[PDB]
Amino acid sequence: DQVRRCLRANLLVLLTVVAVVAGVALGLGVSGAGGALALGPERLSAFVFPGELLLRLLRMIILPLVVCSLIGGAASLDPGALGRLGAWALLFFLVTTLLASALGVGLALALQPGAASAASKEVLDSFLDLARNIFPSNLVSAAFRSYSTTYEERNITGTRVKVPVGQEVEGMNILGLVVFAIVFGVALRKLGPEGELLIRFFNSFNEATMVLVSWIMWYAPVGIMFLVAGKIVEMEDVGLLFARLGKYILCCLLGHAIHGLLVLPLIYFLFTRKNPYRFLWGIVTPLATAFGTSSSSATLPLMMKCVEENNGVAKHISRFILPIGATVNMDGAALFQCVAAVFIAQLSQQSLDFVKIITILVTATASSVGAAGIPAGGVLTLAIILEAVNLPVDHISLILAVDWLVDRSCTVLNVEGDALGAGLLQNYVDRT
Amino acid sequence: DQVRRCLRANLLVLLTVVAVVAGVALGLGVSGAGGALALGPERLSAFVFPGELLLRLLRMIILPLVVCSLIGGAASLDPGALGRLGAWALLFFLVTTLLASALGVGLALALQPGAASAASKEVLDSFLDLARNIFPSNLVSAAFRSYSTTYEERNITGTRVKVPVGQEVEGMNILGLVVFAIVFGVALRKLGPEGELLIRFFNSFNEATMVLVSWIMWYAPVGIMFLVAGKIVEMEDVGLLFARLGKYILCCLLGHAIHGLLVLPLIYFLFTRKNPYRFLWGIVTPLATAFGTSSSSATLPLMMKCVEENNGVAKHISRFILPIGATVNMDGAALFQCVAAVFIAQLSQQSLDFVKIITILVTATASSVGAAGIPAGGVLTLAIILEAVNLPVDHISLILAVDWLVDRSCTVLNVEGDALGAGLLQNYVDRT
Amino acid sequence: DQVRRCLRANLLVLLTVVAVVAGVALGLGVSGAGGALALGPERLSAFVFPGELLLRLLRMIILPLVVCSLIGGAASLDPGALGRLGAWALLFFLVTTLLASALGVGLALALQPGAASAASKEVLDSFLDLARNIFPSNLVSAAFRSYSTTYEERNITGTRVKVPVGQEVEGMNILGLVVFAIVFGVALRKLGPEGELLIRFFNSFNEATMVLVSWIMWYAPVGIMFLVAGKIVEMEDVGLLFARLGKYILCCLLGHAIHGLLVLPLIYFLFTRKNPYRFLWGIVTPLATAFGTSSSSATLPLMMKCVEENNGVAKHISRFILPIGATVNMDGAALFQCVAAVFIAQLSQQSLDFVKIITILVTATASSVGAAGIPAGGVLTLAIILEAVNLPVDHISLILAVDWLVDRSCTVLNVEGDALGAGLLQNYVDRT
Ligand SMILES: NC(=O)CC[C@H](N)C(=O)O
Numbered sequence A, B, C: 001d002q003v004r005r006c007l008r009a010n011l012l013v014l015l016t017v018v019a020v021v022a023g024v025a026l027g028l029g030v031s032g033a034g035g036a037l038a039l040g041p042e043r044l045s046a047f048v049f050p051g052e053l054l055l056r057l058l059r060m061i062i063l064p065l066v067v068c069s070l071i072g073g074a075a076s077l078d079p080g081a082l083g084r085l086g087a088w089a090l091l092f093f094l095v096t097t098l099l100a101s102a103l104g105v106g107l108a109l110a111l112q113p114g115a116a117s118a119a120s121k122e123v124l125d126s127f128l129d130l131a132r133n134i135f136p137s138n139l140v141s142a143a144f145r146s147y148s149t150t151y152e153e154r155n156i157t158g159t160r161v162k163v164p165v166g167q168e169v170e171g172m173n174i175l176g177l178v179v180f181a182i183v184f185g186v187a188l189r190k191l192g193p194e195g196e197l198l199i200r201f202f203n204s205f206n207e208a209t210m211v212l213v214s215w216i217m218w219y220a221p222v223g224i225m226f227l228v229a230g231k232i233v234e235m236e237d238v239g240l241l242f243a244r245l246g247k248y249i250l251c252c253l254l255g256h257a258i259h260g261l262l263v264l265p266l267i268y269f270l271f272t273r274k275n276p277y278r279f280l281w282g283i284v285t286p287l288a289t290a291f292g293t294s295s296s297s298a299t300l301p302l303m304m305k306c307v308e309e310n311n312g313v314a315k316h317i318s319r320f321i322l323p324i325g326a327t328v329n330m331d332g333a334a335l336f337q338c339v340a341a342v343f344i345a346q347l348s349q350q351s352l353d354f355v356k357i358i359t360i361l362v363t364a365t366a367s368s369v370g371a372a373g374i375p376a377g378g379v380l381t382l383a384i385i386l387e388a389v390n391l392p393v394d395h396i397s398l399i400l401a402v403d404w405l406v407d408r409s410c411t412v413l414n415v416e417g418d419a420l421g422a423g424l425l426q427n428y429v430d431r432t
């Protein structure tokens, strides 16, 4: 009857949380067998192994996906700078996403989820190391290794000269590779119709790897349950992690509720001079079903069906920015990246490092225009920024473990983002 | 007269055995000058050098050839799962090639050619190291280096903890790269007509490198004679190597004669319930000329000219599987890879290592559908598996030195393979 | 009036010498503040840093530009071996460029500019190391690292055995990569119309990177002034460098005047048996304006407007070789590469090493057919050979600092090259 309708539509996002609550069970079973009742680090890695094989070939495809889905994207941008009264919305989308992700980290590293009872050093003139990494030395070595400065001593006229020498270290720099792929993407657009084939090569190449990143997602529930099992063994506690998680769902949703209800409505009232609470009261029902379906793509047509008569928006802007803002202005993911990538930074206690805090915030504004629409789409697109800023990505497991609630909490602020942007632009254009 | 006909048609396979019997001559000449009558390892490498330059740029082209001849191959496979009574032949071709290569190694490492008078250690849970190498971490580092586990000691609560740490070591993993290229090859087929260009890119790219691997083969006779000369110098013996070779031609041909005359005719009689010796007695003459021309491509049309009336095969299956089985069901090469790559393993005494024995047997079943048709075509395609399972490939020289007999011995079992498969399928379809 | 005409046409080659004379000014300002009045090597590198960022992403684009502008070049060569009386001009262009670059180094390392008051070791059987580097082991490791032999000791029957072992060291080998790209370029031409797309891919790919190497050149004047400032600090002298430069402009222009006035006119009189000084006296005015505009592309149409009636050249060869020789026979750059890359070799005192002196001379004959037409075009194309023969490329700064005179001195010998080749071919064809 309806056991074929709902169960087969969102099977995978259902099955991926079936996996982790069963993955923790045999994780509890071996800690019910008790710690390393199985043999030590030479044999236990063989039983955490097919959890690595989700994570290992996940890093394989992000070399095509981050560089070939982005050239074909950035070649089809700027359609003649299409809106004199349209590009201000695109500038609105960027500043409401920076300000989204500004309090993203700025709440979490102020609130410290992860380092509660947990309780070499790098100079902040490693900003040039970030800039030397943006523009890579050559491309083929930039697909697997990246630049980094280590300090050695000279011991000449002073026992501590502390000279920075730069040795290229492993792990790719997709942070320094999407900057190539953007600046290659404008290049072959500017060249024009003679090099159209290179677009038609590349934007078919990502759909040749988006079609196999679907195949990786079907491996994920078998894969996830072996890196949540082999993640609670070496931690040995279960009461500890549900306080590790149990503060993280707080700072996400509080990070949404602070953002969603106040700070973009303050952006509303500073330009609209009307009531945002009279504004969104008409559009509660798409924001109701966006929490239900967890898809701004699915609630895309229902927005114009409601906001056009429940609020006085124009005709042509209902289809002009709101199809854009459903897959471009994604403030909901931009919190969810920005508060997770600093959360995993507090799991392993990497570094405070303000130079990383901007590049954990620029990329989180750049994956925010990335994955979209489908539920649990941000899990892939924050898996590329955890490889960008060299975090240990293997802690993705516990933070898509609770994705079933938090992505539904971010989908509603996602769909809210262009909606208030729609009402803000109509008062800028009808006022004339 | 006929000095232009025969001599110019198979010139290269003639000239490559002219080269090695002349290459051993000045190899005997410097050992007739006596050992290192020339200067030592700093000067003798300069005179073995243009033998390395066959072998060095041989490894260059196997990065395009193994990954671009295989996507364009695997995109044109499964034409709608073309045969309800046809795909059983393709399943027949695989199981008669595994069972071919099963006794491939299983004869040779039971018979030990190479380690007769010759007379760190790795754990057999390096199977995960093989599986961690199948699915690579990223593609660009998978074109030149591969994963491997080394054991270091921890010396904490036990002086021998033996922790496996994994450092990526040099030498590419085409074993882990053709698995990408297959699973990319099904990807852009499944995507359909929108990404047809990526096929039309790639299957023109291999013909842009198959046309220069012809040019490498013309360098080979100049090249071979300087790595058979500089291979018998450091071994210093000539009576030793002709016992090294003189057992290898045995186990190949015995490996064919055990396979060809008994074990697939036992596959015949278990399904046909007729006489295979009454079967192949009609088709001795193509099997006669297949030994002569050493080309299943050349003896491809002569098979239907004989087997269709000398035996009661059907009309449509004479052109349905037998054109397939001439370049797909190649059991003759699949012995010849599988008994050489363990033979070279016994020259350098690498390792017994059952984990390698399956991946010396999976790939030998995968290059068996690879190179075809032309004589001495398996020499290239076993040069890619000697780089797969990290054998020293420079001992290819002495085993194409005697290729002139053994490939003619494997061509006849090659052409035999689909022929008995043709007779087996007709008794499965005419019986109805 | 004319402040918009001249100033906006050659702005960049004006602005790049504005930059260096202002870049030396604050370079003099910090040495007017006196040496390391700023903090030491941990802080001064942060203020030489945006000079590195010209040089760093300069090395980025020379992986596409040297391999994708060269396949699309070498696929469109040999149009049916187009001239029975035309290819002798192309053979003339090569031998007048070797003989140009023969005295290129051969003047400079005989005259020693750079090592005047400046006042491990590698064996000359590192020629095989050059040949082992021409033909690379695999392509993807040839885009960032290259082969090199180091000698270790064996200490067995002699305390100094000096065995050469070969470890691959950093820095790419575009010397060994353009040899692939040529021999790939003939491959897909020979394959014909079926692989036309790979040409149409690649010759659109360089115009997708020639269009961003324009964007690098606009960064260059901001970029240059921070690596001439941070180059005179560690040298601390200003009177020293203007003797370092002040001999270099000598050996260039003397290298042109020896070449231009005598040695190709001796090639003239050995075949023409007429007066070259009666020859070029008619064409002083294009050679006048070639010094002025510093562009053989701009003085391309003015050559046929003068040399066709001021000298008795034919009709059809005026448009047959002289459009070729304006962008192929470039002897002016071939001095300017060949005397700079040995000049920078005498700045850092790298090595005398006759094996390098031919590969500093083969590539300088190969970039001579490279960049063209525009003034200061050789600065890019000698930046790729300084990465070829592993020179420190960061001394490009002081030798485009004085490019404004020397390229105008080489443009006139550039345009002279095919002009005398035009007069030489007409006396070979009208004589019949
Ligand atoms: N990561 C997310 O959940 C993004 C928000 C919403 N689900 C979307 O796909 O647009």
Ligand SMILES: NC(=O)CC[C@H](N)C(=O)O
Pocket: B294, B295, B296, B297, B326, B330, B332, B333, B336, B371, B372, B373, B374, B375, B376, B377, B378, B379, B407, B408, B410, B411, B414
């Ligand atoms: N390597 C081989 O000789 C293969 C068998 C046969 N010569 C063929 O080309 O099909």
Ligand SMILES: NC(=O)CC[C@H](N)C(=O)O
Pocket: C294, C295, C296, C297, C326, C330, C332, C333, C336, C371, C372, C373, C374, C375, C376, C377, C378, C379, C407, C408, C410, C411, C414
């Ligand atoms: N590097 C150079 O100046 C080359 C000579 C001349 N300017 C040209 O572009 O052809």
